[PDB]
From a paper:
As the pentose phosphate pathway (PPP) is the main NADPH supplier in most parasites, the enzymes of this key metabolic pathway are considered promising drug targets for the control of unicellular parasites such as Leishmania, Trypanosoma and Plasmodium. Each subunit of the homodimer comprises a NADP+ and a 6PG binding site.
In addition, we solved the three-dimensional crystal structure of Ld6PGD in complex with NADP(H), revealing a previously unknown conformation of NADPH. In our Ld6PGD structure, NADP(H) is located at the conserved NADP+ binding site. Via van der Waals forces, I129 and S130 interact with the nicotinamide ring, which is also hydrogen bonded to a phosphate ion. According to this, the active site loop residues (D257-T262) of the Ld6PGD structure, complexed with a phosphate at the 6PG binding site, adopt the closed conformation. Since Ld6PGD was crystallized under catalysis, in the presence of both substrates, 6PG and NADP+, it could be also the products (R5P, NADPH) or an intermediate state of substrate and product that are visible in the active site. Since crystallization with an excess of 6PG and NADP+ in the crystallization buffer, and thus under catalysis, could have resulted in a feedback inhibition by high concentrations of the product NADPH, we suggest that Ld6PGD is complexed with NADPH in its inhibitory conformation, in which the nicotinamide ring occupies part of the 6PG binding site. As the nicotinamide ring occupies part of the 6PG binding pocket, we hypothesize that only the phosphate component of 6PG can bind at the usual site, while the rest of the 6PG molecule must be flexible and therefore not visible in the electron density.
Author numbering:
A (entry chain B), B (entry chain A): 1 to 478
């Protein structure tokens, strides 16, 4: 008899089984292809553990070995595979047993699974996993959301394998009812989507100045020593630049510029649009990936028009990390992460009102500190910012001093990138527009477009002096 | 007995009845509030065609007075109102009767509504109308899509009341099966969304230079005389700017900068994201409207942060249309509509592949020339561009000479606006990122982010030198 069950021996599924088994819990593993299950026990037999790891080839034996109430963890591809696995388990579980879906699924679908499963005496919990392969093996951050009773039942198992923060608290906190955990996980990736693109966009800017791959990460390493931008994404960005093939060439040169995506980044952008929360940086991150996927279109576009005006190339004479071009981008990069995280948090607060999770916002920022993708220094002030003022109008209001210090310095270098080079900067320029619009009392295009709609649609417009709607009568124009 | 029925006596519904009545067809009208139906006949009883206008207070009398097979046109609010009307019509029509939904609905629901009505012997058609209040009465453009058999019954009515182009063709063409007609209408507004924001953004740019409300439309009038930007949307922009109250103050000063939205702009951005077509300008137009709706956020943000660095103000001493800033902005504006229209058609072509509309694209662009919101000179070359090369990779490839002429001039003026002023330019700058990205064979941020995903997620990456996917072995970073 085992204590827990994990289904899906993928990158996240395989390492998670190793983690809990190392914790002393008896882990039962199952995968759709039984060959993987046999190989899993074969390679991981020389460890100081895995006597608790017993693999099974049939589903009936997988369920029967679990302590009642059963706790089955699902780590398969989100969507059809998760739906396929849950219905397969419905014939091998009993009343009161707990199923846990940990794949990066949609929170809308998460509530549907809860209703369909509670009708047959089954219990469901929706939680998200972040940290990647290494985070899975060492310790990830957990984002659980659903019925509060189920979370406490699996609380000891989750916290043991969870990442341990600097202070000592495990990086897991209950988020709320429904798909609150997956909603947080969905927007956890949304923040990851933008910042990962921000680092890549700054990578393009440095390359636009003739910086070869080595000095680009040299600039990044100096920014890490500053401490403000110290983050896991900075670590992987530096590692990507330093990557070199066996032939001596940089790895980044041979990599095709096509970025795959799986759901979570896309779904969060649509929902933010649907709820009405302005998230240009979050939406632009997804669109930027879509641009890279149309590689055949780009090749045809360049071939059909090769005389593209790319602007006057402006190589930077100083290629050291102390160069003004490097220094200006540091303030440009930092404010874009601040802007992007603000939009990520802005949707989450509005999402809490609409779907009624009962989200504990200050603790959810604190659960990012270690083990997850968004881990870094910036989570300190951001957790503190919403702890001091839970009613903060915008996350940037906590970082006023950093904005004043480098908002101007940010503006010229992007303009310098714009005028001198033809490098696309979708997310960074979206963030700058978000900062300006959210900090200007009156946006002139808001007034004019309101009039424009009234001209043809007679939709009316709002007035500043008095409440209500008024429509001025326009002359015929067709 | 009448031949056609119009349901919904709104701004669009009333004028469409006037159009068809002028054409000689007997129009039967019905509105949910019968007071509107009774009032409608009172003011339009002195017209030369008020014998053709017969109002009905009950739907049963409304249906019984229609020529068999019945053709009822629905022009009510999209969503719940249309669903209520459709179910109400199911009890008063018989087999072979045709229902036409003309509200700006979702094309996904349009195919679903057709299936639900064929199960009771009813026939459905999804069509969109654009042109506003004035366009509806003097002839709008129609975008019908659905069962091809249904189209022929309503062909004489739609083409007769349609706008007449310069050559003479009515601005109506069958688009395809399912919700193809409403899908064109949904992205018709998406193109309208961006350019309306582009004009408002150019209004912001000129206002940031001290041009004041009056001289801004004077600059706009010069661009109208140029002929390149000559369009209905340009005409209403000048009219909106020129609007002045009796007290002498500009109308734009008293208008609250909050922009409402009704479905089509939001839905098109989500669908473009869903299918994977990169349309940042279309998405940014919706996002820009969301920014203007957050009035409470900006007011609180400005109070919580009054020391906003607005940059070095650079007033243009020359406020004439011949000013270099105005001339550069003309080239900056023009290429962004070119970019935005390309994405609108790029989404439409990919949407045709996914849903199998069978879209006749060159004729679908040809229905835009007159009667719709986006009508103007620029639609001419675009119709010709896709006629010469139906497999054209991107509409920007057709406008090579205009791109070469002012792509650089567009880049500098945006940089001047960025450095000197803190005015948000979401849509225009999003288009510039689209222009740059679509014409570079290899995007460096696409390469770097591809490595970033492999570092933590082990997702792999594609290589330029050889086919396949590779995963580089990374050192521990947690
Ligand atoms: C996150 O966690 C979940 C699992 O990630 P990952 O470890 O990469 O596995 P994958 O997302 O690549 O899915 C692999 C698992 O699902 C099934 C497969 O069966 P089999 O391989 O035997 O065919 C295998 O067990 C995903 O939803 C991701 O978004
Ligand atoms: N965005 C654009 O560019 C364009 C928009 N359109 C679309 O055409 C359609 C009609 O536009 P418009 O003329 O302005 O009218 P409205 O969209 O303002 O809707 C008014 C009509 O809908 C009726 N109706 C309204 N609400 C309900 C409800 N819950 N239940 C049942 N019936 C209801 C109203 O009845 P009553 O008033 O008696 O209560 C009235 O007849 C819209 O969908 C619009 O999106 C058309 C052209 C251009």
């Amino acid at each position: 008899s085992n204590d827990l069950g994990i289904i899906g021996l993928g990158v996240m599924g395989a390492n998670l089984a190793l983690n809990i088994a190392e914790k002393g819990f008896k882990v039962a593993v199952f995968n759709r292809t039984s060959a993987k299950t046999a190989s899993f026990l074969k390679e991981h037999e020389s460890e100081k553990f895995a006597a608790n790891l017993n693999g099974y080839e049939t589903m009936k034996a997988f369920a029967a070995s679990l302590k009642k109430p059963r706790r089955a963890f699902i780590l398969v591809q989100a969507g059809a595979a998760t739906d396929s696995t849950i219905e397969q388990l419905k014939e091998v579980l009993e009343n009161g047993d707990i199923i846990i879906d940990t794949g990066n699924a949609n929170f809308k679908d998460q509530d549907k699974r809860a209703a369909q499963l509670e009708s047959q005496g089954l219990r469901f919990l929706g939680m998200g996993i972040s940290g990647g392969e290494e985070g899975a093996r060492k310790g990830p951050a957990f984002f659980p959301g659903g019925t509060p009773s189920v979370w406490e039942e699996v609380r000891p198992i989750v916290e043991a394998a969870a990442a341990k923060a600097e202070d000592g608290r495990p990086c897991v906190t209950f988020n709320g009812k429904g798909g609150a955990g997956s909603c947080v996980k969905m927007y956890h990736n949304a923040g990851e989507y933008a910042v990962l693109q921000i680092w890549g966009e700054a990578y393009t800017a440095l390359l636009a100045f003739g910086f070869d791959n080595d000095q680009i990460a040299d600039v990044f390493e100096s920014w890490k020593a500053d401490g403000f931008l110290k983050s896991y994404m900075l670590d992987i960005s530096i590692a990507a630049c330093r990557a070199r093939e066996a032939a001596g060439n940089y790895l980044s040169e041979k990599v095709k510029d096509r970025i795959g995506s799986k759901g979570t980044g896309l779904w969060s952008a649509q929902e933010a649009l649907e709820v009405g929360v302005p998230a240009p940086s979050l939406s632009m991150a997804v669109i930027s990936r879509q641009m890279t996927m149309c590689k055949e279109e780009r090749i045809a576009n360049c071939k059909a028009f090769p005389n593209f005006p790319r602007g006057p190339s402006a190589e930077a004479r100083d290629k050291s990390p102390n160069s003004p071009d490097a220094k200006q981008l540091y303030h440009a990069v930092s404010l874009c992460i601040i802007a992007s995280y603000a939009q990520m948090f802005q949707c989450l607060r509005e999402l809490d009102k609409v779907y009624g999770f009962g989200l504990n916002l200050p603790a959810t920022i604190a659960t990012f500190r270690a083990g997850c993708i968004l881990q870094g220094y910036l989570l300190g002030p951001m957790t503190k910012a919403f702890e001091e003022n839970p009613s903060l109008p915008n996350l940037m209001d906590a970082f006023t001093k950093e904005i004043v210090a480098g908002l101007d310095d940010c503006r010229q270098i992007l303009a310098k990138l714009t005028v001198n080079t033809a490098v696309s900067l979708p997310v960074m320029m979206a963030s700058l527009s978000y900062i300006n619009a959210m900090y200007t009392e009156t946006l002139p295009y808001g007034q004019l477009v309101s009039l424009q709609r009234d001209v043809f649609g007679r939709h009316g417009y709002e007035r500043t002096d008095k409440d209500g709607r008024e429509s001025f009568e326009w002359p015929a124009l067709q």
